[PDB]
Amino acid sequence: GPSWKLSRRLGISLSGTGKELEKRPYAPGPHGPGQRKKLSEYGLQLQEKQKLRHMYGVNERQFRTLFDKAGKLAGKHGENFMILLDSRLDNVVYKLGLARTRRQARQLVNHGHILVDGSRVDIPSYLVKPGQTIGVREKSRNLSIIKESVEVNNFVPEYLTFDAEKLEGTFTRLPERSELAPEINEALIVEFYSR
Amino acid sequence: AVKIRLKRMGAKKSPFYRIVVADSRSPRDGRFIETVGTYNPVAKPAEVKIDEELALKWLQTGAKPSDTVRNLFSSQGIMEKFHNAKQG
Amino acid sequence: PTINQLIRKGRVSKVENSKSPALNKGYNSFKKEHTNVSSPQKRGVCTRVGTMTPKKPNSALRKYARVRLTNGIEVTAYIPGIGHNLQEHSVVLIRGGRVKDLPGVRYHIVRGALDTAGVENRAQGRSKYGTKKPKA
Amino acid sequence: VMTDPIADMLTRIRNANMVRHEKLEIPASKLKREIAEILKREGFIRDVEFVEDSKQGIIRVFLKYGQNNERVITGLKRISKPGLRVYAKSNEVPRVLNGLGIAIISTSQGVLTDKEARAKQAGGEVLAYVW
Amino acid sequence: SERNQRKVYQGRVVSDKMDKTITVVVETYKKHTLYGKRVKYSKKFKAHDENNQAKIGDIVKIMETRPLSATKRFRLVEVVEEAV
Amino acid sequence: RIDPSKLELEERLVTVNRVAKVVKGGRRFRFAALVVVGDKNGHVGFGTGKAQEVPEAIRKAVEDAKKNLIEVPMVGTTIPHEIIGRFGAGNILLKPASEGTGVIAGGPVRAVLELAGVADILSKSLGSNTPINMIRATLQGLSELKRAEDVAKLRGKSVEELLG
RNA sequence: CGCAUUAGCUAGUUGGUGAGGUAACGGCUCACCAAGGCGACGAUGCGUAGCCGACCUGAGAGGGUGAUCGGCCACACUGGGA
RNA sequence: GGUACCUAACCAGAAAGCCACGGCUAACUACGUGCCAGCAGCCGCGGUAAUACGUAGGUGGCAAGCGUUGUCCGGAAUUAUUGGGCGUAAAGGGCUCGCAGGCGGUUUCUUAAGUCUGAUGUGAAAGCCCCCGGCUCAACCGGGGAGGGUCAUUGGAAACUGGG
RNA sequence: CCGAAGGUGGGACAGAUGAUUGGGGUGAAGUCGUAACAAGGUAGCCGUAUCGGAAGGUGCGGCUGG
């Protein structure tokens, strides 16, 4: 996975950083630095859907089933789907600040183990409910990658609280979608799966 | 004839048993007369749930349980209530 | 119309005809009758492999193999890719695909089938036309 | 003939709207009197008056064009036609233009409106949409 | 403990010609699954007249019962209105 | 009233047809664009424009679209009540929707309802699919809409005597 | 549930009395009489089909399906019998 | 069955393909071909400057799947009850008299078949749905509830349809 | 006594197949005319009869969709 390529095609900083669009803001390829045409309704809905699913790295089976389960909840639809992909556990690891991307946070949940409320979680797609103190076991207590991402100081979002040494990540009420992402346009993705 | 017997529910490797008033004729997962609650074996502890009064109602019309259902009745304590009723 | 007229004559629903009917039947050998099986594919033996032409403005010579099936029906099928193995009396598996250009032909010979070999020198559209992933 | 007079009074009001007439004489059966009384008390009409006579009676309707040229009644409809009668249960009573219009629904306690029959929790014939 | 009540209809006599019996058109009538309008159907039952006190065109009640012969499962209750 | 066009407008187009006229010499072509124009605060309009070129057609269409503007009630970011707009064998129903749905509409209907500022529409075209008559049908359905405040003012009534 | 380019179909069929038979009511079986019975609200005939809880699609109304699982049915190389 | 499982050691080492790229429909260039070979669901491509054929690069879609086929349903308001029509686009019987059927002006009393409402039983278990729980999450399991009858009995209403 | 099967018989329905045949469709710039579309060079069409290689013609009645 190149994943610079995904960002410059989608036209969005999918990390959210000065990287990956500076020096080359066009899409990819031999048909990229020329003036591309604007996309249709279909293309705009695909752009926004794949902005979100390439933020979080989801296949469309999980992405569609979370769209459906978010529809089974209450409120506004596209907000609840953002909320469910910000309860996803790779996102929890990268927003506690334990990795520099979501691939590194994927490898933390997959094998470089990380723990929720006890025993373990080997699964990136684990939806994290509130109230759940997320930390690492005493084996991987402070190793080089989590150590670097502790040395580097990001902001903790207000739907999280994170400690450095004890490293337990605890929660608050719910991640409001004002807090989640400014760039991704929800309710074009609801319209993309409305058809 | 009428027998209070376990009835298999659940996944493959994880069984579950609804304690179910059926006939000896009828199939095990098949048709049945009424049910009392449940039986989790695969819990590492206990956790049986018996209705304890409708089970008692079926015991007195004449319905003799199987061995494991009988000792579940003993664990919740309905066979002692049945013996107190026969001593009544 | 009126509700009483809808009650005593009803709405008669429009007829459905299948686009490929020779797949839409079958055959048992001793009962000597012609069952409705609705099958996706049928193998049959080639009765005549030639080539012939379309009708009007589109003018390029097509491929045209005629096959008698396991239900008993001879249909002219089509051999899609470039350069085909087939002879007369060849075992052929047939899928339903309309060939608009050549008239009277409404099935494809599945390439990669029982005897219809995968096509030669092809790398794009691998699964269609039958050919294996060659080497790299 | 005439086959139902309720639909005919509803079209007579609708044609008087589209022409923007100001008065209507309608031959005034008792259910018509209750329909025009409901449409009076819901402000679709300026006023309605009865003429009790020998032949069959007359009910006169005064259509309300409240502002510049604004048909307060935009359209009428008859739901239960004599040939497909419509009956709604109380948990199926229809609310129309969701709240902004109304449905004359004659339940078991009086010829009611929409909200009245919903709050009295009975159902019956569903016999006019009024927008 | 009063026992369970048997089914009862009222109807209209079609024929008198069978020995000690009649047939009875019950005109209960009902609506569709789809169009909703309510249409009519006439159901003629075989019913026993042990006194044969019936006429064609007679409104009559019938009781259901044990099967009295082939096609018979009904008997008289109260001959309400006589034909003119 | 006629909505005075001094706003910020977004002016995106539906179609440009290439549109012929036969002369002694032969076919002479023009481009007929129709463009929907409006801010997303409740003012919509659309207009046709014809020229030998594509960009002059889009110019004339955006001018004639700014001339005729319509208003739409945006009650709770939806429409107030379900309506069918029926301009001439284009018939389009419009339902209000819940807050999450997004504009459920086909191409030119979607352009009208997005340039209206209405965010949650169930809608469906129940007639012919030319863009011109469908846009006329949508604006017919949005002209006949009614505000609850205005209908309460119409019945000699109050709003809460309607809404409950 | 499909066909009216299937309109007439029944004669133990439709009733009676009596008998036999059945775990039981009954033309279920038999004697003797009566001319009944079903019918365009579709009899009969032909074609198709295990029925359902359910399953798929659909905004829904519907349309299609009747695998698994579960209920009832019918069958056991074909027909008949105990 | 020393099976799920837990614990230690080692190496990015063993592990990605399929389809499409004219429009619908996201995704484009180049070389060869020259109405041939061929593509195609449709509009239709290709007759020496082919983004439509074959290949390469690229991109896009998905992803241990992907594509084709066969049938269902939707799209299709294209059987229209919801929800269509008949002057000229398909469609008013050539016209009448009329049986059955359907529909029925007004006031009032009464009835309660239709209609609405209540109670009771029931529409098994699983399934869809809601709420919680357990499988490392998920699928799935489990618990608890809901739903679904022109259903039967029973009790109220009387506006409307029907009955007198 | 009943009775499955089998036997004989005359019908009924349904599928094949059959010398030959009749209309239909589609097809490489085939042959004969030019009936219709314009006042289409005889206004056309509808019904019906009749004749004629063929489109068609002619009669009668009707229609404007002159």
Q: How many CB atoms lie within 10 A of CB A109?
A: 25
Is the minimum CB–CB distance between E36 and chain D shorter than 8 Å?
yes
Whose tokens are 């739409």? That residue is: F72
Give kind and range of the element (H or E) at residue E40.
strand E38-40
Q: Do chains D and F touch (3 or more CB pairs under 8 A)?
A: yes
The conformation of residue E60, written as its DSSP 8-state character, comes to E
The whole-angstrom separation of Cα A105 and Cα A38 is: 34
Residues of chain D contacting E37 with CB distance shorter than 8 Å: 83-85
Query: Closest approach of chain F CAs to the CA of D20, in angstroms?
Result: 16
Query: Closest approach of chain D CAs to the CA of F81, in angstroms?
Result: 5
The whole-angstrom separation of Cα D49 and Cα D61 is: 7
The C-alpha angle C48, C51, C54, rounded to 5 degrees, equals 125
Length of chain D, please?
Answer: 131
Q: Are F109 and F34 in contact (CB under 8 A)?
A: no
The conformation of residue D100, written as its DSSP 8-state character, comes to T
Task: Name the amino acid, one letter, at D79.
Answer: I
Is the minimum CB–CB distance between F154 and chain D shorter than 8 Å?
yes
Contact F146 D97 (CB under 8 A): yes
Of A137, A113, A138, A139, nearest to A126 (Cα)?
A113
Residues of chain D contacting C2 with CB distance shorter than 8 Å: 83
Q: Are F79 and F121 in contact (CB under 8 A)?
A: yes
The conformation of residue E38, written as its DSSP 8-state character, comes to E
Length C24 CA → H73 C1' (Å) = 19
For residue E42, give every residue at least 6 positions away whose Cβ sits within 8 Å of its Cβ, in sequence order, or none: E25, E26, E27
Length C126 CA → I28 C1' (Å) = 38
The whole-angstrom separation of Cα D52 and Cα E33 is: 44
Cβ contacts from C onto D, under 8 A: 4
Query: Which nucleotide lies nearest residue C56, CA to C1'?
Result: I27
Q: Are B40 and B16 in contact (CB under 8 A)?
A: yes
Q: Are B19 and B50 in contact (CB under 8 A)?
A: yes
Is the minimum CB–CB distance between D98 and chain F shorter than 8 Å?
yes
Length F131 CA → H26 C1' (Å) = 24
Contact between the CB of E31 and strand G at under 7 Å: no
For residue F39, give every residue at least 6 positions away whose Cβ sits within 8 Å of its Cβ, in sequence order, or none: F7, F8, F9, F10, F115, F117
Q: How many CB atoms lie within 10 A of CB C22?
A: 21
The whole-angstrom separation of Cα C25 and Cα C33 is: 10
Length C72 CA → I8 C1' (Å) = 39
Query: Closest approach of chain E CAs to the CA of D84, in angstroms?
Result: 5
The whole-angstrom separation of Cα D34 and Cα A62 is: 59
The whole-angstrom separation of Cα F46 and Cα F62 is: 8
Backbone φ and ψ for E44, nearest 5 degrees, come out as -100, 125
Of F48, F38, F44, F46, nearest to F16 (Cα)?
F48
Query: Closest approach of chain F CAs to the CA of D15, in angstroms?
Result: 18
Testing the interface with F: which of D40, D41, D68, D100 to mutate, by most F Cβ within 10 A? D100
The C-alpha angle D80, D86, D91, rounded to 5 degrees, equals 135
Residues of chain E contacting D83 with CB distance shorter than 8 Å: 37
The C-alpha angle B85, B87, B88, rounded to 5 degrees, equals 60
Sign of CA dihedral C80, C85, C86, C92: negative
- In strand I, the nucleotides that come within 7 Å of a protein beta carbon are 26-28
Give kind and range of the element (H or E) at residue A146.
helix A144-151
Residues of chain C contacting E39 with CB distance shorter than 8 Å: 7
The conformation of residue C17, written as its DSSP 8-state character, comes to -
State the first-to-last Cα distance of chain D, in angstroms, to the nearest integer. 28
CA distances for D59 relative to A146, B86, C88, D74, angstroms:
87, 83, 91, 21
Cβ contacts from A onto F, under 8 A: 29
Of A41, A49, A11, nearest to A28 (Cα)?
A11
State the first-to-last Cα distance of chain A, in angstroms, to the nearest integer. 29
CB hemisphere CA count around F155 (13 angstroms): 27
Longest dimension (CA), chain A: 54
Q: Do chains A and B touch (3 or more CB pairs under 8 A)?
A: no
Contact D97 F148 (CB under 8 A): no
Q: Are F62 and F35 in contact (CB under 8 A)?
A: yes
Is the minimum CB–CB distance between D101 and chain F shorter than 8 Å?
yes
Contact F107 A41 (CB under 8 A): yes
Hey, what are C65's tokens?
């193999």
Give kind and range of the element (H or E) at residue F131.
helix F131-143
Hey, what are E81's tokens?
């209105």
Q: How many CB atoms lie within 10 A of CB A51?
A: 21
Where does chain A show beta strands of DSSP type E? 115-116, 134-135, 160-162, 169-171
The whole-angstrom separation of Cα D13 and Cα C7 is: 32
Residue in chain F closest to D70 (alpha carbons) equals F154
CA distances for A7 relative to A13, C89, D16, F75, angstroms:
6, 57, 64, 38
- In strand H, the nucleotides that come within 7 Å of a protein beta carbon are 6, 8, 17-21, 24-29, 35-46, 54-64, 66-73, 76-81, 84-86, 101-108, 113-117, 124, 129-131, 134-138, 140-144, 150, 153-154, 156-161
Residues of chain F contacting A71 with CB distance shorter than 8 Å: 100
The whole-angstrom separation of Cα C22 and Cα C36 is: 10
Length E70 CA → I1 C1' (Å) = 26
Dihedral-angle region of residue F152 (phi above 0 means left; psi in -120 to 50 means alpha; beta otherwise): alpha
For residue B26, give every residue at least 6 positions away whose Cβ sits within 8 Å of its Cβ, in sequence order, or none: B32
The whole-angstrom separation of Cα A95 and Cα A76 is: 24
Name the 3-class secondary structure at A144: helix
Testing the interface with E: which of D79, D80, D81, D84 to mutate, by most E Cβ within 10 A? D84
Query: Which nucleotide lies nearest residue D106, CA to C1'?
Result: H159
For residue F32, give every residue at least 6 positions away whose Cβ sits within 8 Å of its Cβ, in sequence order, or none: F16, F17, F18, F19, F48, F49, F50, F57
Length C47 CA → I21 C1' (Å) = 30
Task: Name the amino acid, one letter, at D38.
Answer: I
Please spell the DSSP secondary structure of C26-66, one letter per residue: --BTTTTB------SEEEEEEEEE-----SSS-------EE
Q: Which of F98, F102, F107 sits opposite A191 (nearest CB)?
A: F102
Contact E32 C7 (CB under 8 A): yes
Residue in chain C closest to D85 (alpha carbons) equals C3
Contact between the CB of E26 and strand G at under 7 Å: no
CB hemisphere CA count around B83 (13 angstroms): 7
Q: Which of F100, F107, F110 sits opposite A78 (nearest CB)?
A: F100
Residue in chain D closest to E38 (alpha carbons) equals D84
Name the 3-class secondary structure at E48: strand
The whole-angstrom separation of Cα D98 and Cα D94 is: 9
Name the 3-class secondary structure at F18: strand
CA distances for A78 relative to B46, D109, F76, angstroms:
44, 46, 17
Q: Outline where D3-113 has alpha helix (H).
A: 5-19, 30-41
Name the 3-class secondary structure at C18: coil
Length F27 CA → I42 C1' (Å) = 38
Testing the interface with C: which of E34, E40, E41 to mutate, by most C Cβ within 10 A? E34
- Neighbouring chains of E at 3+ CB pairs under 8 Å are C, D
For residue C49, give every residue at least 6 positions away whose Cβ sits within 8 Å of its Cβ, in sequence order, or none: C64, C65, C66, C86, C87, C88, C90
The whole-angstrom separation of Cα A42 and Cα A170 is: 40
Q: Are B19 and B72 in contact (CB under 8 A)?
A: yes
Q: How many CB atoms lie within 10 A of CB D89?
A: 9
The whole-angstrom separation of Cα A101 and Cα A124 is: 13
Give kind and range of the element (H or E) at residue F143.
helix F131-143
- Neighbouring chains of B at 3+ CB pairs under 8 Å are none
Longest dimension (CA), chain E: 45
Q: Are F70 and F5 in contact (CB under 8 A)?
A: no
Q: Quick one: CA torsion of B19, B21, B26, B30, rounded to 10 degrees?
A: -50
The whole-angstrom separation of Cα D22 and Cα A28 is: 71
The whole-angstrom separation of Cα F33 and Cα F49 is: 5
Sign of CA dihedral D18, D20, D25, D28: positive
The whole-angstrom separation of Cα A22 and Cα A2 is: 16
Contact between the CB of E42 and strand G at under 7 Å: yes
Chain F interface, Cβ < 8 Å to A: 98-104, 107, 110, 119
The whole-angstrom separation of Cα E83 and Cα A14 is: 91
Please spell the DSSP secondary structure of chain B, one letter per residue: -EEEEEEEEE-SSSEEEEEEEEESSS-TTS--SEE--EE--SSSS--EE--SSHHHHHHHHH-PPPHHHHHHHHHHTHHHHHHHHH--
Q: Quick one: CA torsion of D7, D11, D13, D18, rounded to 10 degrees?
A: 160
Q: How many CB atoms lie within 10 A of CB A10?
A: 20
Q: Are A124 and A106 in contact (CB under 8 A)?
A: yes
Of F103, F70, F87, nearest to F137 (Cα)?
F87
For residue E2, give every residue at least 6 positions away whose Cβ sits within 8 Å of its Cβ, in sequence order, or none: none
For residue A130, give every residue at least 6 positions away whose Cβ sits within 8 Å of its Cβ, in sequence order, or none: A171, A172, A173, A174
Of A22, A88, A76, nearest to A52 (Cα)?
A88
> How are beta strands E43-48 and E72-81 bridged, if at all?
parallel
For residue A119, give every residue at least 6 positions away whose Cβ sits within 8 Å of its Cβ, in sequence order, or none: none
Of F47, F63, F40, nearest to F136 (Cα)?
F47
Q: Are C93 and C41 in contact (CB under 8 A)?
A: yes
Strand I contacting residues by CB (7 Å): C 55-56, 103
Residues of chain A contacting F103 with CB distance shorter than 8 Å: 191
CA distances for A127 relative to A104, A130, E27, angstroms:
18, 10, 63
- In strand G, the nucleotides that come within 7 Å of a protein beta carbon are 3, 13-17, 25-28, 34-39, 41, 61-63, 69-72
Contact F155 D44 (CB under 8 A): yes
